[PDB]
């Protein structure tokens, strides 16, 4: 028992982070077969940040421009292409480490593992989520572009994220593989604000069920309401609206507890209309509401990778 | 900028785990050099394991009674030795996949990396702080025996914990790679409390530099105070006693921010003494005390490994 913000194993994403330099420019990149992956802004200046045309600066550029280093393998760079906010630089030599892969767009309200990296190495693995406003909360560093967030399914390598950069405000914005950014966001130094984002209300329950399941129950009550009731409640205090397919998805925790979603629903009522009193939740202050439904039948499960 | 509770990149961990089978317990195992290491009650069946005479259990047991498995390979045993609680595995074959690494001791309130693993199957990775009694507050399930913690510097890893038990509160007990528990627990299911635990002061205040740094900085206040004095308000309210010691390690820190560590000592005596009046630090409702000022300075750099 116990229940913790937890990664996913790392090992298969770090043999694949390379460093790629263009000119004074250095940062991450992503080595699977023989393509390596970074963000397209690696090409840029200083100046040329506030618009730049990334066009006019790929064409200034040749293969031997990237310089790309697995550790100290030097990779020889036989081709580039841009497709939207990502470079791919076609590589001679396949990565004898590029594991199961694939890439996915992962929906607001999802999780993911993320692996910081510097100048091509590997520095920490932490959890989080896709922001409804498609921001992450994460812990990056000017250098920390181009790492990668990640799933993993058996021996299956997920990646949906590659970091690109971060907001005034301290939240951080990225793409997909294919170079497609999450959100209105886009690679110029120009003022672009995140809309309001919101508590991802079905990630909020599936954390009451991890709690019951270790034994964190005083929150329970014996009171029921309705979806609409309920989703009146979520309005006033900036929740996500509850669905029906949210409430399927809750449907084996549901099951393995025996409380019914509409019953943790009226906990969870209480709790926004009366905060906390002062105790804790699975040692927290606050409501959470970066566990999935999966993850949380993941780590009272016992499942490996 | 940003702050994650953060972990050691696993790979060079990952690599290490094996399945060990004795008789009917599988259980984790650490495979390095031409050793595997793994808890010793791997040789226990349900009863005997209420007083089990190891030296007894062991003595039934031949070098081919013990299965070791690294993915689908099957290692040769040669040799079986018992180390404290830990049982030493000799295999004919060297770990192609060890790493530079020592096995160390790690101090109450220091932090450390875990993989938890299933089967021999790495499952997820979390950070957690070995707590003043010598308890960790783990997320472990039933096969998670001979998971290990581990801390990485540059290409060492240092493995300090290796998994044991899980006692009825719910907290977790294990050993270092030498076989020796932290704490006053012994490998028998009989009644073994922990002490009383407390606060890591000195985590709380690294983390309240590592706030100052992010920009929340509401806490600040235009009071100080003197170790003797916040060291009567920590022990009202369960905080280990501040030193000298610890002061001089929050050093950086304090150049850093240009906050003296009596002035933020001051912050923490307004904080302990009147809550947080439902605000938030980093993101907390309540005060961390799992990050060490080491921690704080690594995250809030940049370094890699
Ligand atoms: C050359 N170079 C550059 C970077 C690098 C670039 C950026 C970065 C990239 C682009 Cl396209 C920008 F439009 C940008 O404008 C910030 C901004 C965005 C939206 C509205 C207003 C503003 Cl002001 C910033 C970055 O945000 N970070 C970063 C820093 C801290 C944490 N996370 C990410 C790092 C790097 O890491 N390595 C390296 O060599
Ligand atoms: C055969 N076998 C056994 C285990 C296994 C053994 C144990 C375990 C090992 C020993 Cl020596 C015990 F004295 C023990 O008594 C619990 C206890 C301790 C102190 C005071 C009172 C009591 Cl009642 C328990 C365990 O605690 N866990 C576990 C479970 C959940 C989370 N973390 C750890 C697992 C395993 O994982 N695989 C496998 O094959």
Same mark, same amino acid.
Request: hydrophobic share 35%; proline share 4%; net charge neutral.
């Given at each position: 028992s116990g229940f913790?913000?937890?990664?996913?194993?790392?090992?298969?994403?770090?043999?694949?982070?390379?460093?790629?330099?263009? @000119?004074?420019?250095?940062?991450? @990149?992503?080595? /699977?077969?023989?393509?390596?992956?970074?963000?397209?802004? %690696?090409?840029?200046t200083s100046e040329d940040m506030f618009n730049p045309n990334y066009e006019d600066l790929l064409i200034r550029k040749s293969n031997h421009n990237f310089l790309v280093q697995a550790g100290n393998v030097q990779?020889?760079?036989?081709?580039?292409?841009?497709?939207?906010?990502v470079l791919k630089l076609k590589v001679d030599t396949a990565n004898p480490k590029t594991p199961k892969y694939k890439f996915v767009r992962i929906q607001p309200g999802q999780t993911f593992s993320v692996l910081?990296?510097?100048? @091509?190495?590997?520095?920490? %693995?932490?959890?989080?989520?896709?922001?409804?406003?498609?921001?992450?909360?994460?812990?990056? /560093?000017?250098?920390?572009?181009?790492?990668? @967030?990640?799933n993993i399914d058996y021996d299956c390598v997920s990646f949906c994220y590659m970091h690109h950069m971060e907001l005034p405000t301290g939240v951080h914005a990225g793409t997909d593989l294919e170079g497609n950014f999450y959100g209105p966001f886009v690679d110029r130094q120009t003022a672009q604000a995140a809309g309001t984002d919101t508590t991802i209300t079905v990630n909020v329950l599936a954390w009451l069920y991890a709690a019951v399941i270790n034994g964190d129950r005083w929150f329970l009550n014996r009171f029921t309401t309705t979806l609409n009731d309920f989703?009146?409640?979520?309005?006033?205090?900036?929740?996500?609206? /509850?669905?029906?397919?949210?409430?399927?998805?809750l449907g084996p925790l549901s099951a393995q507890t025996g409380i019914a979603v509409l019953?943790?629903?009226?906990? /969870?009522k209480e709790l926004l209309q009366n905060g906390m009193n002062g105790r804790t939740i699975l040692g927290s202050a606050l409501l959470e509401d970066e566990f999935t439904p999966f993850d949380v039948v993941r780590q009272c499960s016992g499942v490996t990778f």
């Open positions: 913790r913000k937890m990664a996913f194993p790392s090992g298969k994403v770090e043999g694949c982070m390379v460093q790629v330099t263009c @000119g004074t420019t250095t940062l991450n @990149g992503l080595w /699977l077969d023989d393509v390596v992956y970074c963000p397209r802004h %690696v090409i840029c990779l020889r760079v036989i081709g580039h292409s841009m497709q939207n906010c910081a990296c510097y100048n @091509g190495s590997p520095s920490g %693995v932490y959890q989080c989520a896709m922001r409804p406003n498609f921001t992450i909360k994460g812990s990056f /560093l000017n250098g920390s572009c181009g790492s990668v @967030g990640f989703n009146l409640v979520a309005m006033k205090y900036n929740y996500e609206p /509850l669905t029906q397919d949210h409430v399927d998805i019953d943790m629903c009226a906990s /969870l």
